[PDB]
Amino acid sequence: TTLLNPYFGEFGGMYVPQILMPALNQLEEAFVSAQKDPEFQAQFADLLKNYAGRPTALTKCQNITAGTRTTLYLKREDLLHGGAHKTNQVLGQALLAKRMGKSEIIAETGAGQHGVASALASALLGLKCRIYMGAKDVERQSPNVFRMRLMGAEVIPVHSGSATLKDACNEALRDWSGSYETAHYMLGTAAGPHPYPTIVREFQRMIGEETKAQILDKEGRLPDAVIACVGGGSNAIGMFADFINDTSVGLIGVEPGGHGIETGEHGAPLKHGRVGIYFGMKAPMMQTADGQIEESYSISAGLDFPSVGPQHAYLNSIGRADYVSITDDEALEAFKTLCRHEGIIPALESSHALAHALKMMREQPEKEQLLVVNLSGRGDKDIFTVHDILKARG
Amino acid sequence: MERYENLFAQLNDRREGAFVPFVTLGDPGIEQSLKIIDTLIDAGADALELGVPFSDPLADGPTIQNANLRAFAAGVTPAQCFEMLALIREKHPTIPIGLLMYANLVFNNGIDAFYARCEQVGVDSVLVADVPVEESAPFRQAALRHNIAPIFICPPNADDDLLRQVASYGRGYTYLLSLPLHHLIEKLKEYHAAPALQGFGISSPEQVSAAVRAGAAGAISGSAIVKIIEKNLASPKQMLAELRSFVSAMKAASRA
Ligand SMILES: [Cl-]
Ligand SMILES: [Cs+]
Numbered sequence: 001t002t003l004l005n006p007y008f009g010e011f012g013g014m015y016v017p018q019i020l021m022p023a024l025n026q027l028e029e030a031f032v033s034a035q036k037d038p039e040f041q042a043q044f045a046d047l048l049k050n051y052a053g054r055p056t057a058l059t060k061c062q063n064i065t066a067g068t069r070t071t072l073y074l075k076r077e078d079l080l081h082g083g084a085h086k087t088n089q090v091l092g093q094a095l096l097a098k099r100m101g102k103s104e105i106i107a108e109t110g111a112g113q114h115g116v117a118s119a120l121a122s123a124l125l126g127l128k129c130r131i132y133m134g135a136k137d138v139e140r141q142s143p144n145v146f147r148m149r150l151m152g153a154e155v156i157p158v159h160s161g162s163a164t165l166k167d168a169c170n171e172a173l174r175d176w177s178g179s180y181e182t183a184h185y186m187l188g189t190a191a192g193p194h195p196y197p198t199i200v201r202e203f204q205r206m207i208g209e210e211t212k213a214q215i216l217d218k219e220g221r222l223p224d225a226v227i228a229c230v231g232g233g234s235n236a237i238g239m240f241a242d243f244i245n246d247t248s249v250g251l252i253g254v255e256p257g258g259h260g261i262e263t264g265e266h267g268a269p270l271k272h273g274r275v276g277i278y279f280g281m282k283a284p285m286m287q288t289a290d291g292q293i294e295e296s297y298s299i300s301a302g303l304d305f306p307s308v309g310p311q312h313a314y315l316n317s318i319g320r321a322d323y324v325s326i327t328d329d330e331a332l333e334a335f336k337t338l339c340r341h342e343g344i345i346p347a348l349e350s351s352h353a354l355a356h357a358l359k360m361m362r363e364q365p366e367k368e369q370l371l372v373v374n375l376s377g378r379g380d381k382d383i384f385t386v387h388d389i390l391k392a393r394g
Numbered sequence: 395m396e397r398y399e400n401l402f403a404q405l406n407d408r409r410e411g412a413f414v415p416f417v418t419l420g421d422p423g424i425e426q427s428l429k430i431i432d433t434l435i436d437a438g439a440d441a442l443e444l445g446v447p448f449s450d451p452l453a454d455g456p457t458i459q460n461a462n463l464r465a466f467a468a469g470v471t472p473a474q475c476f477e478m479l480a481l482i483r484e485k486h487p488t489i490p491i492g493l494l495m496y497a498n499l500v501f502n503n504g505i506d507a508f509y510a511r512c513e514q515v516g517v518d519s520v521l522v523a524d525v526p527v528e529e530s531a532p533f534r535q536a537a538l539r540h541n542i543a544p545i546f547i548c549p550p551n552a553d554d555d556l557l558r559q560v561a562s563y564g565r566g567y568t569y570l571l572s573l574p575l576h577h578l579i580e581k582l583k584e585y586h587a588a589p590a591l592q593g594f595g596i597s598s599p600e601q602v603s604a605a606v607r608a609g610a611a612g613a614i615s616g617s618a619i620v621k622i623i624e625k626n627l628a629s630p631k632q633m634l635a636e637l638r639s640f641v642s643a644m645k646a647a648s649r650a
Contacts, residue, residue, distance in 0.1 A: 001528055015497055017453040018526045018556070019549040019571070160459050161449065170452040277497040277524070278450055290472055291502030292449040 003032050006194030008314035014193040016280045020173070023180035028195040030100045035202065040095065047091050051124065052081040054088075054206065058214040058372075063341040069368040070361040071219070074354075074375040075211050075239065078346065084302075084377035085207065085235045086117040090186060092203035094121040097184035104183035105129040108172045110137050110165030111301030112144025113377070114188035119153035121186075129153040132172045134164040141301070143381075164295055165304050169279055189232025190309040193280030197233075197309050204238025211372055212242050219370060225250030225360075228374035229352040230270065230323065231302055233309030235376040244320065251321035253312060254352045256298030260327055267296025268325045270308045270316060283310045299328040299385070300348035302377075326352040326359075334358055335379065335386060347377035348385065397490040397518045398543060398566040401440060402589055402611060411648035412440040412612025413602060414591060415619045415641060416494070418461035419444050419478055420470030422627060427465075430623065430637060431482055437638045438645035441490040442482075443521075443614055446475045448496040453523040457617040460624065472499055476515055483516035492519040492545060492566070497533075505532055509540040519566040521545035527559040534563055545569055548578065548590070561585030569593050570610060579609035599647030606650050615644065 002025065006014050014024055034040040048054040057076040065072050077085040097105060105127045109115030115131040122129030131148055135157040138145055148155050161167035169192075176185040190200040208226075215223055226243060228236035230253040243249040258266035266272065273284040278293055286294040286306035296306045315321035326334075331348060334355035338346050346354060353373050360371065379386075405412055415434050420427050431442065447465040451458060483491065493512065500508045500522055512520060520542055525533055527546055534544035543566030548557065550572045560568060561582060568587050570578065572594035582590050589611035596602060596613045605613045622640060626633035 013529055014526065015524050015529060016526060017524055017549075018547050019551065021526050021528065022551055022553075160456070161463070166450060170450055173452050174455070277501045279452075280524070282501075287498070287502075291499045293498070 002194065003028055004195060004198060008197075008311045009317060011275075011281070011283050011310035011313040012194055012197060013282050014280060015277050015282065016173070016193050017177065019177050020180070023176065023185075024193055024195065026100065030096060031195055031199050034096055034099055040099065044092055044095055047095070048088065048206065052087050052091065053079060055210045055214075056080055058211060058218065060218070061342055064337060064358075065361060068361045068365040071370045072357060072361070073215065073223070073372045074344070075207060075372060076375055077207065077235065078344070078350070078375050078378035082117050082120060083380070084113050084117070084347065085204065085238065085374075086114055086188070087120075088206065088238070089200050089203035089234060090114075090117045090121040093184065093186045093199070094125045094127060097127060097186070098125060100184065102182060102184040103127060104179065105186050106132070106172050106175050106179070106183050107186040108132050108165065108168040108188060109144075110134065110168065110304045112137070112141040112148070113302055115153065115155070116144055116147050116151075118186050119148040119151035122153060123151045130175075131155050132158055132168040132175070134162070134168050135159045136163045137165065137168070162295060166279075166293060166295065166306055189305060190234040190237045190311065191232045191279065191281060191283065191305065191307060197281070197311055200234045201237045201241055201311065204234050205241040207235070207238040207374065208240060208242035211239065215372060221370065222246055222249050223372045224369045225252050226372045226374065227252040227254065227353045227357050229254045229256070229303065229349050229376065230308060230312060231256070231267070231349065232305040232307075233312045235374055237309060237311055239374040240315070240321065251315065252356065253321060253323045254356045255323060255325045256296065256300060256303040256352055257325035257327040257330070258297040258299070261325060265297045266325065267298045267303050267306070269296070269306060270313060270323050271325065273307075279307060281307070281310050283307050284313050299331060300352065300382070302347065302349040303352070324356055326355045330355040330359070332386065332389065335382070344375070345379040345383070346375055347379045348382040350374070350376045351379070395516070395518070395541070397488060398441075400488070401490055405440065405611070409650060411602065411606035411610070411650065412591060413438065413641070413645045413648050414441045414443055414612060414614040415439050416443040416445065416614060416616045417619055417623075418458065418465055419446055419475045420465035420468055421461045421620070421623060422464045423468045424470060424474060424478065426630060428478060428481065429634065432485070433634045433637050434619070434641055435486055435489060437641035439489070439641055440612065440645070441492065443492045443494055444479070445494045446472055446499055448499055451496060451523070455617065457620050457624065461620045476511060479515040479517060490518040490566070491516070492521065493517055495520055495522050497522050497524050500533065505536045506539070509536045509542050512542050513540040517542065519543035519545050521547070521569060527556065527563055530563060543588075547571055548582070552578070554581070557581050557587075558585055561587035564588045567591045567611065569614070576608050583609075599643050602644050602647035603650060606648055612648060
């Protein structure tokens with residue numbers, strides 16, 4: 001059947017139309033052999049080092065923790081080429097596509113960051129790239145659409161359904177069912193049918209590997225907790241993976257709380273959704289009582305995925321990792337604080353992680369604790385959104 | 395009840411193939427849908443394949459995506475579909491009725507509970523579009539426990555191990571998507587699979603005749619019927635007359 005386990009406990013699987021199963025089996029086999037292939041590993045490491053900018057810095061915050069016993073470090077995936085952690089895994093997947101003899105790339109995108117990342121990896125490696133985007137998201141992210149077009153990607157708007165990310169996830173699958181002979185489906189997060197939750201984790205796991213070596217170098221000990229926001233789960237599982245067996249290290253994922261869990265307008269499926277089956281996996285998701293799939297809501301477009309990676313649902317169930325939520329307002333405050341005190345503009349996505357670290361520090365200011373936040377991207381893309389909200393308030 | 399065995403037994407003594415229209419339940423309204431289905435049967439459909447509107451039908455093309463949107467606009471819910479299924483079955487005791495489902499609607503209130511409810515309203519078979527045979531065990535076990543036939547799609551890219559799983563696991567009929575066609579039918583009857591219905595791009599009477607002559611027990615028109623509904627949304631009476639003319643023409647073609 002498969003070479004690797006498609007399930008994490010009870011979550012995961014390969015819930016796709018029969019016609020896509022050979023494509024997933026081909027992909028899993030190519031991934032397993034790429035992972036045992038020193039030549040592939042060296043090409044991948046070469047691209048990450050000399051093209052994307054790895055290793056990224058681990059910055060000790062100077063000012064933000066003043067008057068507490070917290071020491072806060074930031075893993076600076078905002079300094080990665082493209083400005084977000086997504087770049088790591090699209091380079092790996094593009095090298096995989098070439099290894100399989102594929103020449104075309106399919107990708108879905110909502111906020112546009114995965115579409116930009118897939119377009120730049122495709123231009124670098126000589127792959128023709130077509131990108132599906134919900135027409136609601138096309139209208140609202142015309143900067144990112146221009147970027148993709150500058151990089152030679154074909155952008156295709158989706159009006160099906162609610163014309164957002166989830167409906168882009170569907171039309172990419174339809175395309176790939178016909179075109180997988182020559183096309184690779186470059187999924188954007190650590191979710192979907194096996195083997196994608198495993199692949200995206202392994203192509204993001206250097207975040208945690210570097211963090212561990214960097215924190216041991218600087219502080220001589222492992223952190224008390226590493227904290228990362230969770231839209232689909234790729235940046236969080238990439239930070240977590242190398243600490244999973246270090247059972248003294250807290251693992252904290254932060255889901256978007258939106259206007260508040262109690263309002264119903266949030267994007268926290270792991271803690272406040274319900275297990276269902278969609279997008280090729282059994283996982284917690286945003287759904288109605290009838291079993292229809294809703295959208296997440298968050299101020300940060302990048303946490304818009306209405307489900308969550310199945311390895312996260314597994315880690316939660318066994319108690320290895322804890323998951324919390326942070327509202328729009330808490331994230332906005334963290335955005336402003338990092339700007340004013342450290343001179344770093346964080347992505348509104350990453351600001352949810354930082355906001356929870358600030359909560360831990362402020363609620364117990366005499367607790368000694370060593371925290372690492374995964375700063376998954378930079379916030380230049382969010383300054384217009386933040387500006388308008390702050391004008392509308394005063 | 396074994397409606398499929400009875401259907402095929404009579405069809406074979408009359409050397410006919412089966413003609414099976416697909417239609418989305420509640421498209422474009424609940425009452426108009428109920429009249430569309432009564433027209434399809436009366437014009438000669440041998441069985442029915444019915445979709446329950448789902449938010450994210452990732453295995454469907456645009457014609458069915460729009461059919462779901464029309465039904466959602468009409469307020470159709472899974473519960474209202476089951477109410478409709480009980481009515482249809484009350485009017486038409488012998489026609490086989492198959493459901494095309496997505497896994498989340500089957501999983502939502504419990505897999506076993508879903509198949510119990512199908513048995514209650516008299517549904518004969520269930521195809522779950524996004525459950526491959528490799529993941530099917532809890533679905534087909536629940537189906538068999540409630541006397542429901544689990545339907546599996548045999549795709550064009552099928553290898554031999556898939557044919558053996560499809561032949562052992564399926565009941566009622568095999569859903570054929572378009573390796574030479576004639577060879578697929580022969581391997582399937584070699585492995586004693588449920589009778590194969592060809593279901594890829596069946597649009598004209600000539601395609602129905604080709605499928606039967608090629609060894610398939612019949613044909614499913616998977617979207618040509620929904621196109622007729624889409625074409626004629628403004629004129630309900632022209633909609634039913636076009637549906638009547640098309641279905642009787644397609645069903646005449648199955649008489650080889
Ligand atoms: Cl560097
Ligand atoms: Cs989420």
